[PDB]
Design a protein around this ligand. Structure first.
Ligand SMILES: Nc1ncnc2c1ncn2[C@@H]1O[C@H](COP(=O)(O)OP(=O)(O)OP(=O)(O)O)[C@@H](O)[C@H]1O
Ligand SMILES: [K+]
Ligand SMILES: [Mg+2]
Ligand SMILES: [Mg+2]
Ligand SMILES: [Mg+2]
Ligand SMILES: [Mg+2]
Ligand SMILES: [Mg+2]
Ligand SMILES: [Mg+2]
Ligand SMILES: [Mg+2]
Ligand SMILES: [Mg+2]
Lengths: 175, 118, 133, 79, 47, 73, 211
RNA sequence: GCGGGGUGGAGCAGUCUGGUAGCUCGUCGGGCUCAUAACCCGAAGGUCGUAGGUUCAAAUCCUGCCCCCGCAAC
RNA sequence: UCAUGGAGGUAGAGCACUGUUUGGACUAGGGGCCCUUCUCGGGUUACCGAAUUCAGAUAAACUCCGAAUGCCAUGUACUUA
RNA sequence: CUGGGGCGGUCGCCUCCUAAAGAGUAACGGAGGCGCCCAAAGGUUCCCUCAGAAUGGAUGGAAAUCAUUCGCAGAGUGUAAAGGCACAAGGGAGCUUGACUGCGAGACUGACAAGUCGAGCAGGGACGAAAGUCGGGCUUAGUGAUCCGGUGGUUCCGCAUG
RNA sequence: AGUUCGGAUUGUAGGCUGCAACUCGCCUACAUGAAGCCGGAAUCGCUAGUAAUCGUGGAUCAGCAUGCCACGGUGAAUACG
RNA sequence: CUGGUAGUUAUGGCGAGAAGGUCACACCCGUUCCCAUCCCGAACACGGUAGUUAAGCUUCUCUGCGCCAAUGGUAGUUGGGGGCUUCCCCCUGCGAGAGUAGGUCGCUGCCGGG
């Protein structure tokens, strides 16, 4: 619990002495992380999920759920009910471990890593990026990846605004 | 995030329950309310709305601390007593929107054990 | 004028009883043409009246056509008996009731306006009068 | 978590082999190595290339300004 | 989609008629249904 | 082209408020629950409201946008 | 009519040595079957393989796919095998399963090839236990064509086929971009199809770039 | 309004039975010939009138429109 | 007939949905003059323009509303057959 | 049948409007559908809730999947439409076969034939702890007389008796 | 064996010539390693030191040849008619 | 007073703002057992009270949205009677919708702890 220890040790006091909260429970936390592939190629081949699911479970440490289409679309040649991509929800020890691994190891492995966009905020106080290419993570080899695809990483927060969210993520080590 | 209200979703379930259960003098409803510290419970008829009998893990009597589950059993036994006193023999169980798994099932089966019939 | 898309092609004739539901009070323009009696008014009549008003105003002013020909009518051809179905649609009409302001003008003086509305009314099967804000 | 469904996930020590930055965190990959870092526990060792401890965006980044391109080359070749 | 008699295994008596899609259900259906001769529930299979 | 209709099904009410009614009687034929079933009243497969005990019909409001019917001896 | 629709797998150069086989006497229970006199097989070759009953043919094909070093198939060859006794199917799976597992290719392409074999929509969920002697052959060949193969190898595909399917297979082997090594006791089929011949006679295997 | 049709440049299939582009003539190129034709050798040229649907996929099954040939009406 | 209680969605009215529609704001996008140019992206055009939104009209097969009458019944009322 | 007959169309069942606020109500009056399907698209028990928009986002775009917010339903309801449904009748999962046998006080409708609803009693079961629900599907179409033959079954008859 | 075949094409760096080598010379080094696994219908030279094959030289010319004209080295098959 | 539990057509709501509390309701802490998730101790479920009133929750304030809401008139209308009859007028009775004055942050009841 490297980063959880770190959190409760340093950042909560620091962050609350900055934003001047009326109590200790107004202080933001990360509720969860949500990883999602977003596969559309699975309309035409079943091997693609067979890759992506195993690959997320290796990247992440728990099985992903294959998400399905809420409605049918002909512009993508997409019938309702088809399996489209998979997702994982990381909470607790494993979201903390995922951020640890992320900033420590994998974010630097990107081609020209000069951080990531600070403007990428939903407006409500949460953050999203996307790993362009899953080989960036160490748990998976490059020699296993038939074809690269990315995945969205949502870092959800109890923060009420972009400022508090950014400071939380800056103290945790997101550039 | 706007987190949930557990009590509100619990009442949404409780309406699924109450669309098929209500209480009458011949056969009241035995409601179970559950909290994290304790359990409350009542026996009431809906035609009138007078809680005929009750019990809880907040009283001055019979207190004990067996991790709240055997306390639930005690509350069951105690409504059974206090209702067989007032003449009640038959009721319909109302799980309050909570599941019939743990503390609630324990309460229920303690009642069924003692002098109370479903 | 026509409606572009219609749900039901064929439609009952209807009534023109009662005063107009609304549109009796000239709102937008300064002057306007009020129907004193009820009648149908066709798209062709509206086009004629509009053009006459606009020519006399010589591309001046702002015109408003309040009415629209929503409803349709049929007519059976000649030499065709009664029955064997309802006829085919021929034309679009507005059932105008009494009190209704069919046309409004802003942007011109009294004389021009009154004379253009006069020129318009003669193209219409309704007895009219002219009325100000 | 269920039984049987998820893959083997265990606490593993990363080490940046650029500067020997040691760091514990959970993962699912041995890299065929084991150490007993943070005395009282065994941990596999998932060695790695550059980490946050050494990446230029987190550290100095002015490096690799080596040549202007064709110009010093011309002037170096012909004086 | 075809109509189907259902006979009892203990009796051989055709206690019921129902239907099935003959592609999605290509086999003799089996279902537990009451046999009034025996006055108990009994397994009936298609004929 | 056109010109076909179906036989009408005699929907609507069949007993009045204040009218004594014997059990099993039909009270309101309908599609869906244009009137919900109430006290001593059922709803059939085709949504018909029928009485279950001998009693006296009463039409009664539920919340604003809905109605029911009950039978009280 | 039937005709087979093949995806453009790989188009390696006509003339590339696909299999070099050096001269070697063979035996399976110790007893000699024949002596190979050495040879090579190039890409685009429609090689027939001829012999009597119990001649060594199926044995030789097993040696190929087991990669005897005396029979060096070059890399990038992508073998694909069809057996006399149809072991290449899984008798448990439905045929959409059996073919969508082994197809490297798109679902649309998988279904196009099945259509070219003239399997109806009703058939896809039938057991392999549930099929005609000809439909099983078509299953393995359709599976072989979905696999990305550049080198088909086919022990007696003429077994349970009708005239339409034999003509369509003739067309297939005769038009096939890659390379192919087939067995058939139909003189008609082998005359219609054979650009090259592998002949087993009097315990002597030989090779001929004839018909 | 009623029938046929609309598929490389022309005439015709293929549609009913969805995966399959075909026959004859022609065109382009190279040969033969002093040159053209004929003949011999190769190759190109069609998203099937069109806009939408259904289907894993449409010349093909469904719908609307636009064109041509006939027959009526006028 | 009087009283009382009820079902019911017509006339009318209304726009709270669905359609039809007028004017204004504003625009995805299409056409052009083009600057250019791997026409990539801009100057953009009132030449149009999906939609979105503000005000105002319309409706047998539209309704947030909604009568009179008529209908069902109850009563011991008051007449009458 | 028929605004003469004929051609063309129609002939039986369901849904709206006409149909005038109970019901019913015609026309060669205006619009559409049916002659099925489903072994789960049924029964129960438990669980939850949609469309669409605003942004944030890697392939990925007007629009696939994801996070947050708004959102009484602007979705879905096997299929036409009307009514109705979010305290489900809409969606998942488990267990199953009540898509049971005998019947049915009483009502609806109604020329007759027929069609419709039905609490409840008994038998023996399914689900659920239980209450209790379940005699097909949110409802309303999905169908056709007798006569004659066929199949299965039966403590029925069997032209003097067997 | 698409191979240590083949040697194109391309990148960088060199050398000569010439006032000058982008358009537009030749040559070198390194790397790249293309097409090509003996050629459709057709069609050409050759009867002896010839054909085939290997190098050499000369002219033109600062430089710029797979072209041209001469040189020798090796050295066949066949001609029924 | 507060925790449950009801009924009442939202005057009862939505939104905004303020005060308070491990007495309760909570949030929170953990997954060691039951049991759990197309993944996930978020939910459910279990075991606990270290921190907090931030939010849910209790109380209070409001008329921004919503909802209700007359009186008067107008429409339409039963019956009767007139005409000039796409329609209209008059007598009597009934009588809207819209809109407006105005109301609304709930109102009653039971049980248990304190
Ligand atoms: N594993 C084995 N063990 C023993 N004998 C074998 C084995 N495999 C094959 N044989 C024998 O080898 C001989 C030829 O075998 P194989 O079946 O390969 O012949 P073939 O020429 O392919 O025949 P066919 O075309 O009739 O199948 C036969 O006598 C056969 O019995
Ligand atoms: K006039
Ligand atoms: Mg039914
Ligand atoms: Mg067979
Ligand atoms: Mg095709
Ligand atoms: Mg009206
Ligand atoms: Mg209307
Ligand atoms: Mg009526
Ligand atoms: Mg006898
Ligand atoms: Mg000679």
């Amino acid at each position: 619990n490297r980063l959880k220890d770190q959190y409760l040790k340093e950042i909560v006091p620091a962050l609350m002495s900055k934003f001047n909260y009326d109590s200790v429970m107004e202080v933001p936390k990360i509720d969860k992380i949500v990883i999602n592939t977003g596969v559309g190629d699975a309309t035409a081949n079943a091997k693609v999920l067979d890759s992506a699911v195993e690959e997320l479970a290796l990247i992440t440490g728990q099985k992903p759920v294959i998400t399905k289409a809420k409605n049918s679309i002909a512009g993508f040649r997409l019938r309702e009910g088809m399996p489209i991509g998979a997702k994982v929800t990381l909470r607790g020890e494993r979201m903390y471990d995922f951020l640890d691994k992320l900033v420590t190891v994998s974010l630097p492995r990107v081609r020209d890593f000069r951080g990531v966009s600070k403007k990428a905020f939903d407006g409500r106080g949460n953050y999203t990026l996307g790993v362009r290419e899953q080989l960036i993570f160490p748990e998976i080899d490059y020699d296993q990846v038939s074809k690269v695809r990315g995945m969205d990483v949502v870092i959800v927060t109890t923060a009420k605004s972009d400022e508090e969210s950014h400071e939380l993520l800056t103290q945790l080590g997101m550039p | 995030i706007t987190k949930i209200d557990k009590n509100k979703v619990r009442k949404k379930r409780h309406a699924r329950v109450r669309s098929k259960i209500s209480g009458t003098e011949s056969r009241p409803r035995l409601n179970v309310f559950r909290s994290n510290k304790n359990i409350y419970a009542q026996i009431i008829d809906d035609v009138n709305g007078v809680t005929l009998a009750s019990a809880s893990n907040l009283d001055k009597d019979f207190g004990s601390a067996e991790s709240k589950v055997d306390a639930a059993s005690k509350v069951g036994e105690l409504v059974a007593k206090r209702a067989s006193e007032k003449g009640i023999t038959s009721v319909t169980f109302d799980r309050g929107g909570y599941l019939y798994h743990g503390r609630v099932k324990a309460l229920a089966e303690a009642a069924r054990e003692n002098g109370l019939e479903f | 004028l026509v409606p572009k898309r219609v749900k039901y092609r064929r439609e009952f004739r209807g009534n023109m009883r009662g005063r107009a539901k609304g549109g009796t009070e000239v709102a937008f323009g300064e002057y306007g043409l009020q129907a004193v009696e009820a009648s149908w008014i066709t798209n062709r009549q509206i086009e004629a009246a509009r053009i006459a008003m606009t020519r006399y105003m010589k591309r001046g002013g702002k015109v408003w056509i309040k009415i629209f020909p929503h409803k349709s009518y049929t007519s059976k051809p000649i030499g065709v008996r009664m029955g064997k179905g309802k006829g085919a649609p021929e034309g679009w009409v507005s059932p105008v009731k009494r009190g209704k302001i069919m046309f409004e003008i802003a942007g011109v003086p009294e004389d021009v306006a009154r004379e253009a509305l006069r020129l318009a009314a003669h193209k219409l099967p309704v007895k009219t009068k002219i009325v100000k804000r | 978590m269920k039984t049987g469904i998820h893959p083997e996930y265990r606490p593993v020590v990363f080490v940046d082999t650029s500067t020997d930055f040691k760091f514990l965190s959970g993962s699912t990959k041995s890299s065929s190595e084991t150490i007993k870092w943070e005395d009282g526990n065994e941990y596999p060792l998932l060695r790695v290339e550059i980490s946050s401890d050494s990446h230029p965006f987190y550290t100095g980044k002015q490096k690799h300004a080596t040549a202007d391109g064709r110009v010093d080359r011309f002037n170096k070749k012909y004086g | 989609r075809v109509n189907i008699t259902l006979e009892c295994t203990e009796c051989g008596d055709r206690n019921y008629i129902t239907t099935k899609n003959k592609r999605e259900n290509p086999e003799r259906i089996e279902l537990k249904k009451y046999c009034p001769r025996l006055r108990r529930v009994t397994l009936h299979r298609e004929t | 082209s056109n010109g076909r209709d179906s036989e009408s099904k005699r929907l609507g009410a069949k007993r009045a408020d204040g009218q004594f009614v014997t059990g099993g009687s039909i009270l309101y034929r309908q599609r869906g629950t244009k009137i919900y079933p109430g006290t001593n009243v059922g709803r059939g497969g085709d949504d018909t409201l029928f009485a279950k005990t001998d009693g006296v019909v009463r039409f009664e409001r539920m919340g604003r946008d809905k109605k029911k019917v009950s039978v009280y001896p | 009519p039937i005709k087979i629709i093949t995806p453009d797998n790989r188009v390696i150069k006509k003339g590339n040595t696909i299999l070099s086989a050096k001269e070697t006497a063979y035996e399976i229970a110790g007893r000699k079957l024949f002596e190979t006199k050495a040879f090579s097989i190039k890409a685009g070759d429609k090689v027939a393989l001829i012999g009597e009953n119990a001649s060594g043919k199926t044995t030789f094909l097993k040696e190929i796919i087991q990669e005897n070093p005396n029979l060096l198939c070059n890399p990038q060859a992508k073998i694909a095998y069809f057996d006399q006794e149809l072991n290449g199917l899984n008798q448990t799976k439905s045929l959409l399963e059996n073919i969508s597992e082994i197809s490297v290719q798109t679902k649309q392409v998988n279904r196009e090839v099945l259509g070219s074999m003239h399997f109806k929509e009703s058939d896809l969920h039938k057991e392999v236990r549930m099929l005609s002697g000809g439909e099983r052959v078509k299953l393995l060949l359709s599976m072989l064509l979905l696999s990305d193969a550049n080198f088909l190898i086919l022990d007696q595909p003429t077994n349970y086929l009708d005239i339409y399917a034999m003509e369509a297979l003739e067309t297939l082997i005769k038009q096939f971009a890659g390379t192919v090594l087939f067995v058939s006791h139909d003189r008609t089929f082998v005359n219609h199809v054979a650009e090259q011949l592998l002949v087993i006679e009097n315990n002597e295997m030989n090779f001929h770039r004839m018909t």
